[PDB]
Curated annotation (Swiss-Prot), chain A:
It comes from Homo sapiens (Human). It is found in: Secreted. Belongs to the IL-2 family. Disulfide bonds join 55-97. One of its GO terms (biological process) is adaptive immune response. The gene is IL2. Transmembrane segments: none annotated. Keywords: Adaptive immunity, Chromosomal rearrangement, Cytokine, Disulfide bond, Glycoprotein, Growth factor, Immunity, Pharmaceutical, Proto-oncogene, Secreted, Signal. The keyword Thylakoid does not apply. This is Interleukin-2. Cytokine produced by activated CD4-positive helper T-cells and to a lesser extend activated CD8-positive T-cells and natural killer (NK) cells that plays pivotal roles in the immune response and tolerance. Binds to a receptor complex composed of either the high-affinity trimeric IL-2R (IL2RA/CD25, IL2RB/CD122 and IL2RG/CD132) or the low-affinity dimeric IL-2R (IL2RB and IL2RG). Interaction with the receptor leads to oligomerization and conformation changes in the IL-2R subunits resulting in downstream signaling starting with phosphorylation of JAK1 and JAK3. The chain holds residues 24 to 153 of 153 of the full protein. Its main location: secreted. GO terms for molecular function: carbohydrate binding; cytokine activity; glycosphingolipid binding; growth factor activity; interleukin-2 receptor binding; kappa-type opioid receptor binding; kinase activator activity. GO terms for cellular component: extracellular region; extracellular space. It is linked to A chromosomal aberration involving IL2 is found in a form of T-cell acute lymphoblastic leukemia (T-ALL). Translocation t(4;16)(q26;p13) with involves TNFRSF17.
Swiss-Prot record, chain B:
Receptor for interleukin-2. The receptor is involved in the regulation of immune tolerance by controlling regulatory T cells (TREGs) activity. TREGs suppress the activation and expansion of autoreactive T-cells. Residues 2-60, 62-125 form the Sushi domain. Disulfide bonds join 4-107, 29-56, 31-58, 47-64, 91-123. Non-covalent dimer of an alpha and a beta subunit. IL2R exists in 3 different forms: a high affinity dimer, an intermediate affinity monomer (beta subunit), and a low affinity monomer (alpha subunit). The high and intermediate affinity forms also associate with a gamma subunit. It is found in: Membrane. It comes from Homo sapiens (Human). It comes from the Eukaryota. This is Interleukin-2 receptor subunit alpha. It is linked to Type 1 diabetes mellitus 10: A multifactorial disorder of glucose homeostasis that is characterized by susceptibility to ketoacidosis in the absence of insulin therapy. Clinical features are polydipsia, polyphagia and polyuria which result from hyperglycemia-induced osmotic diuresis and secondary thirst. These derangements result in long-term complications that affect the eyes, kidneys, nerves, and blood vessels.
């Protein structure tokens, strides 16, 4: 009903907030990109329901440690701002998270959770 | 404050350490064979009247100074260096150097581009 539509709004916002980060790092005019890709992030054992966002939440601190690597400002906006806006949206969407066996690149991580948000949005608008 | 995008060059059978870790230098949190940093753990430590901040965890003088160790860290430390950092090369055990040129490298920026001065060394045994 209405609950689902407000939910997929929150997903759209989280999703663009991620979209912009991963465009801003997956650009060639980013030198440090290799140095970022050098770090591995724990991946969800599976992500299909909103509670799994715990996993994303957990990796949030390492992730900003990656973004602080870029010292210019493709966006121009304290990385803490993006990260905390995203964190608030994540909380607005407490649980136990199991991860995948292997870590993955920052790109891989963000592709996964972006695909996840668009997955869930497409899921709900059914009925 | 400016970091080398690249790591210092490798010499066959040689290791590059540092005598002064310049404010800016960061140290990866890298665990032993079989060990994974904590979930929601720091990926690296960083230098900042100036010392380090953050700490690593694993589970199956104008500059900062050599950080103390942590439980189950991988043998091989891994850093990344800001410009003006000098990194000194030494040969492995069982080998010996020839220094046919300088045995150090420096994070330098030229017209906006980070580079490491090519050291000149090789080791026989």
């Amino acid at each position: 009903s209405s609950s689902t539509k407000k939910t997929q709004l929150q997903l759209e916002h989280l999703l663009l907030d991620l979209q912009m980060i991963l465009n801003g790092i997956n650009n060639y005019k980013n030198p440090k990109l290799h140095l970022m890709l050098s770090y591995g992030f724990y991946m969800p054992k599976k992500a299909t329901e909103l509670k799994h966002l715990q996993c994303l939440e957990e990796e949030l601190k390492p992730l900003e440690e990656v973004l602080n690597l870029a010292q210019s400002k493709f966006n121009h906006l304290r990385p803490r701002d993006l990260i905390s806006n995203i964190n608030v949206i994540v909380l607005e969407l407490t649980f136990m998270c199991e991860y995948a066996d292997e870590t993955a690149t920052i790109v891989e991580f963000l592709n996964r959770w972006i695909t996840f948000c668009q997955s869930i949005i497409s899921t709900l608008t059914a009925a | 404050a400016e970091l080398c995008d690249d790591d210092p060059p490798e010499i066959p059978h040689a290791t590059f350490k540092a005598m002064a870790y310049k404010e800016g230098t960061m140290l990866n949190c890298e665990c032993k064979r079989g060990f994974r940093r904590i979930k929601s753990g720091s990926l690296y430590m960083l230098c900042t009247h100036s010392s380090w901040d953050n700490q690593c965890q694993c589970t199956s003088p104008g500059h900062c100074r050599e950080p103390p160790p942590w439980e189950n860290e991988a043998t091989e430390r891994i850093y990344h260096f800001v410009v003006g950092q000098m990194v000194y090369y030494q040969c492995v055990q069982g080998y010996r150097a020839l220094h046919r040129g300088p045995a150090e490298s420096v994070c330098k920026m030229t017209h906006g581009k980070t580079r490491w001065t090519q050291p000149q060394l090789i080791c026989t045994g």
